[PDB]
Amino acid sequence: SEYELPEDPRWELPRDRLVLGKPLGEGAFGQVVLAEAIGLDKDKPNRVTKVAVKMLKSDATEKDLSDLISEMEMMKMIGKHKNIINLLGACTQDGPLYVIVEYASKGNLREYLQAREPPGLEYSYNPSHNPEEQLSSKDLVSCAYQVARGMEYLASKKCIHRDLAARNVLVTEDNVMKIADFGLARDIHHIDYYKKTTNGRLPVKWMAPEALFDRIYTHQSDVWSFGVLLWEIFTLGGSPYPGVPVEELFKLLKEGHRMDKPSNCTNELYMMMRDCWHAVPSQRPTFKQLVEDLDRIVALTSNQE
């Protein structure tokens, strides 16, 4: 926002080393396009890497710029992990801001899930059936595990992803889960909780009771989001709280309203959803425990007697 942008030799990439390709999507906050960076590897400056570049539109606003800059600096602290879109570099000096991150060839989890066929056996009766390309219980469970494993990392780094949803989860060509779309994420180092503004820019159907009503964010608030994400994964792209408008959700939540167990979802996994949606944030599981439980669930689902 109208201020000098520092020079980071560590991540700065020569603007002439980035060959822009076609766009991968557009949003009111920015635009993402595919491309190729030359020599990201110092050991071999002649090696090309396929990357995704995050930039603003000609109609971008001041906020859109702060977000893009916030996402850059935030991805430097968090570090790198196999379950998150790692920062590869950026172009900050003399020209438009370009944030270079890993490329997910299979889109986000929402799209990814709605594109394939559900785990249920009944779908085999349909004329158009593709057994070779049909999601299974293990696949769904594994996705939740990988995202959990990812969030467990962010938490250890004292980082909060105030917006955890299927939309912000990409799938690589190897079907690997990678949490993405940082920007609203904030640091907790030296603090107990992050205070949000009166009206935030985060989906209400993914916000926790304490954050949505008391403007309080904690690693426990991200857990609540995770609970809603599980619902999506087991509904294969479903939309939280079906039929109920955002305006009426505020009241229901106070009365203790919660979503019902999705079809083709084991009670074992639904209890985890209700566990994450505990009224009291401290009473909710921790990403540390979730990875453990989800790990055991994967082991069982893999060997169901």
- For residues 60 and 85, state if they share a domain: yes
Entry resolution in angstroms? 3.2
Distances (CA, A) of 217 to 87, 208, 256: 25, 8, 20
Instruction: Check whether residue 210 and residue 280 sit in a common domain.
Output: yes
Q: What is the spatial distance between Cα 273 and Cα 279, in angstroms, rounded to a whole number?
A: 12
d(CA 210, CA 292): 25
Q: Pick the last residue of a domain from 72, 103, 134.
A: 103
Sequence-distant (6+) residues with CB within 8 A of 173 are: 105, 106
Question: CA 151, CA 270: separation in Å to the nearest integer?
Answer: 19
**Domain range enclosing 62:** 5-103
The two tokens of residue 1 are 């926002």
Rounded Cα distance between 290 and 141, Å, is: 12
3-state DSSP assignment of residue 90: strand
**Which of 42, 70, 103 finishes a domain?**
103
Q: Is residue 215 part of a domain?
A: yes
Catalytic site residues?
Answer: 163
Query: Which among 105, 102, 85 has a CA at the least distance from the CA of 175?
Result: 105
Query: Structure tokens of 88?
Result: 């590869």
CA atoms within 13 A on the CB side of 80: 6
User: Cα dist. 156→162, 169, 187, 188, 287 in Å?
Assistant: 15, 19, 11, 10, 9
187 and 58 share one domain? no
| 39 and 169 fall within a common domain | no
- The separation between CA 113 and the C-alpha centre of its own chain, rounded to angstroms, equals 14
Q: What are phi and psi of 43, to 5 degrees?
A: -65, -20
Conformational region of residue 151, where left means phi above 0, alpha means psi within -120 to 50, and beta covers everything else: alpha
Angle at the Cα of 118 from the Cα atoms of 113 and 121, rounded to 5 degrees: 165
Technique used to solve these coordinates: X-ray
Q: Would residue 305 count as lying in a domain? A: no
Are 182 and 290 members of one domain?
yes
Give the burial class of 73: count Cβ atoms within 10 A of its Cβ; 0-12 exposed, 13-18 middle, 19 or more buried.
Answer: middle
- Residues forming beta bridges with residue 48, ordered by sequence position: 38
200 and 227 part of one domain: yes
Tally the domains of the chain: 2
Separation of alpha carbons 237 and 274, rounded Å: 19
131 and 249 co-located in one domain = yes
Q: Dig out the tokens for 128 from the structure.
A: 């158009």
Q: Are residues 219 and 238 in the same domain?
A: yes
